[PDB]
Write an enzyme that holds these catalytic residues in place. Structure first.
Site, short mmCIF file in Angstrom:
data_model
loop_
_atom_site.label_atom_id
_atom_site.label_comp_id
_atom_site.label_asym_id
_atom_site.label_seq_id
_atom_site.Cartn_x
_atom_site.Cartn_y
_atom_site.Cartn_z
N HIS A 1 0.65 -1.24 -0.07
CA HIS A 1 -0.06 -0.15 -0.02
C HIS A 1 1.08 1.41 -0.04
O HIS A 1 0.42 2.35 -0.20
CB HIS A 1 -0.94 -0.14 1.21
CG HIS A 1 -0.56 0.45 2.56
ND1 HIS A 1 -0.08 -0.58 3.35
CD2 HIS A 1 -0.37 1.52 3.00
CE1 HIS A 1 0.25 -0.25 4.71
NE2 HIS A 1 0.16 1.10 4.42
N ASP B 1 -0.16 -7.42 1.63
CA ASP B 1 0.55 -6.30 1.75
C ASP B 1 2.07 -6.17 1.52
O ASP B 1 2.47 -5.29 2.27
CB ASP B 1 -0.32 -5.53 2.70
CG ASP B 1 -0.25 -3.95 2.39
OD1 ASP B 1 0.16 -3.35 1.43
OD2 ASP B 1 -0.49 -3.05 3.55
N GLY C 1 2.86 6.61 8.79
CA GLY C 1 4.33 6.65 8.24
C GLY C 1 5.07 5.55 8.47
O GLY C 1 6.36 5.79 7.92
N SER D 1 4.47 2.22 8.46
CA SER D 1 4.45 0.74 7.87
C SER D 1 5.60 0.53 7.13
O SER D 1 6.23 1.44 6.54
CB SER D 1 3.27 0.88 6.85
OG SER D 1 3.47 1.72 5.56
C1 LIG Z 1 -3.44 -1.12 -2.25
O1 LIG Z 1 -3.24 -2.58 -2.11
C2 LIG Z 1 -3.22 -3.15 -0.84
C3 LIG Z 1 -3.32 -4.52 -0.27
C4 LIG Z 1 -3.29 -5.11 1.08
C5 LIG Z 1 -3.65 -4.03 1.99
N1 LIG Z 1 -3.90 -4.50 3.49
C6 LIG Z 1 -4.07 -3.48 4.49
C7 LIG Z 1 -4.14 -3.96 5.82
C8 LIG Z 1 -4.00 -2.01 3.81
O2 LIG Z 1 -4.42 -1.21 5.21
C9 LIG Z 1 -4.57 0.11 4.87
C10 LIG Z 1 -3.26 0.72 4.91
C11 LIG Z 1 -2.92 0.53 6.03
C12 LIG Z 1 -2.24 1.71 6.99
O3 LIG Z 1 -2.52 3.01 6.95
N2 LIG Z 1 -0.76 1.38 7.31
C13 LIG Z 1 0.14 2.04 8.44
C14 LIG Z 1 0.85 3.25 7.79
O4 LIG Z 1 1.58 4.02 8.37
N3 LIG Z 1 0.62 3.58 6.37
S1 LIG Z 1 1.52 4.82 5.87
O5 LIG Z 1 3.22 4.69 6.15
O6 LIG Z 1 1.25 5.99 6.45
C15 LIG Z 1 1.18 4.60 4.07
C16 LIG Z 1 -0.36 5.08 3.79
C17 LIG Z 1 2.06 5.54 3.26
C18 LIG Z 1 2.04 4.07 3.06
C19 LIG Z 1 0.62 1.80 9.78
C20 LIG Z 1 -0.61 2.38 9.64
C21 LIG Z 1 -0.54 3.71 10.59
C22 LIG Z 1 -1.50 4.58 10.98
C23 LIG Z 1 -3.13 3.96 10.79
C24 LIG Z 1 -3.74 5.15 9.91
C25 LIG Z 1 -5.33 4.57 9.99
C26 LIG Z 1 -5.53 3.50 8.81
C27 LIG Z 1 -5.94 2.15 9.99
C28 LIG Z 1 -5.83 1.14 8.92
N4 LIG Z 1 -6.17 -0.05 9.94
C29 LIG Z 1 -6.51 -1.28 9.11
O7 LIG Z 1 -6.54 -1.44 7.85
O8 LIG Z 1 -6.78 -2.43 10.05
C30 LIG Z 1 -7.03 -3.84 9.78
C31 LIG Z 1 -5.98 -4.71 10.18
C32 LIG Z 1 -8.26 -3.66 10.21
F1 LIG Z 1 -9.39 -2.81 9.88
F2 LIG Z 1 -8.97 -4.89 10.20
F3 LIG Z 1 -8.34 -3.61 11.81
C33 LIG Z 1 -4.55 0.77 8.46
O9 LIG Z 1 -3.28 0.83 9.25
N5 LIG Z 1 -4.31 0.88 6.93
C34 LIG Z 1 -5.34 0.78 5.92
N6 LIG Z 1 -4.16 -1.62 2.90
C35 LIG Z 1 -3.76 -2.69 1.93
C36 LIG Z 1 -3.82 -1.90 0.30
#
Ligand SMILES: COc1ccc2nc(C)c(O[C@@H]3C[C@H]4C(=O)N[C@]5(C(=O)NS(=O)(=O)C6(C)CC6)C[C@H]5/C=C\CCCCC[C@H](NC(=O)O[C@@H](C)C(F)(F)F)C(=O)N4C3)nc2c1
Ligand SMILES: [Zn+2]
Length: 197
Positions: free
Chosen positions: A75, A99, A155, A157
């Site tokens: 992602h 992911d 930020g 992940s």
């Molecule tokens: C496109 O193809 C795919 C294939 C598989 C995917 N698989 C997941 C999983 C996913 O998830 C999304 C992204 C992820 C997220 O946000 N990642 C962090 C982060 O920092 N990213 S980032 O660096 O800023 C960024 C965006 C620049 C890269 C660590 C978080 C920090 C803060 C969180 C901010 C609020 C969003 C909460 C959400 N919670 C969630 O989904 O919980 C799941 C387990 C639930 F709902 F079941 F509980 C979540 O964390 N994300 C929602 N996108 C996928 C997309």
């Protein structure tokens, strides 16, 4: 057709320094040089350490070297190449179902060792070099010992969860929150990486 653009490369823009007693973020490239390096895919900066801070044109996140592979989240990176001294490097691992993506680890990086301790007392390393205690709660989940707003995890992940001995237990994927407070984290276990390999 002749107008179609190409997405830029992921670019290493800094690192989380874990070599001493104090963890701290270092920037190695500013936004201008990042934008240019993303377009050319040519990054001649020396790489060091295990946890890199990476950016595209629109997102910034982390990437972690484990067993000679620089791992991050789909992602963040999508299917993008990563910039390197001799041009864009194609992913060697891509798994949207996890992911997960990976490239060969950059020359000069250091790789974490995959954990075989079976310990549930973990440590999440964030892009601000916070080291956050996390109790493992399942194959892909752990609870923060001290919850905090999700803003503090945004930020990070692609960063590592480490065991007490500093081995890699997993790659931070998503945050689980209530009313904006992160109480738990979702992560890709290192065994899932070791299998993908
Ligand atoms: C496109 O193809 C795919 C294939 C598989 C995917 N698989 C997941 C999983 C996913 O998830 C999304 C992204 C992820 C997220 O946000 N990642 C962090 C982060 O920092 N990213 S980032 O660096 O800023 C960024 C965006 C620049 C890269 C660590 C978080 C920090 C803060 C969180 C901010 C609020 C969003 C909460 C959400 N919670 C969630 O989904 O919980 C799941 C387990 C639930 F709902 F079941 F509980 C979540 O964390 N994300 C929602 N996108 C996928 C997309
Ligand atoms: Zn261990």
């Amino acid at each position: 057709m002749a107008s179609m653009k190409k997405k830029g490369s992921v670019v290493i823009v800094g690192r989380i320094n874990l070599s001493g007693d104090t963890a701290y973020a270092q920037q190695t490239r500013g936004e201008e040089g990042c934008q240019e390096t993303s377009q050319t895919g040519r990054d001649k900066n020396q790489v060091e350490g295990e946890v890199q801070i990476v950016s595209t044109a629109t997102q910034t996140f982390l990437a972690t070297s484990i067993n000679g592979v620089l791992w991050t989240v789909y992602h963040g990176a999508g299917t993008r190449t990563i910039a390197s001294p001799k041009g864009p490097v194609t992913q060697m691992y891509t798994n949207v179902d996890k992911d997960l993506v990976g490239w060969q680890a950059p020359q000069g990086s250091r790789s974490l060792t995959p954990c075989t301790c079976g310990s549930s007392d973990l440590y999440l390393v964030t892009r601000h070099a916070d080291v956050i205690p996390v109790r493992r709660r399942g194959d892909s989940r752990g609870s923060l010992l001290s919850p905090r707003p999700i803003s503090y995890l945004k930020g990070s992940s692609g960063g590592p969860l480490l065991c007490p001995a500093g081995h890699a237990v997993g790659i931070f994927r998503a945050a689980v929150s209530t009313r904006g407070v992160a109480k738990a984290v979702d992560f890709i276990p290192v065994e899932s990486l070791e299998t993908t390999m």
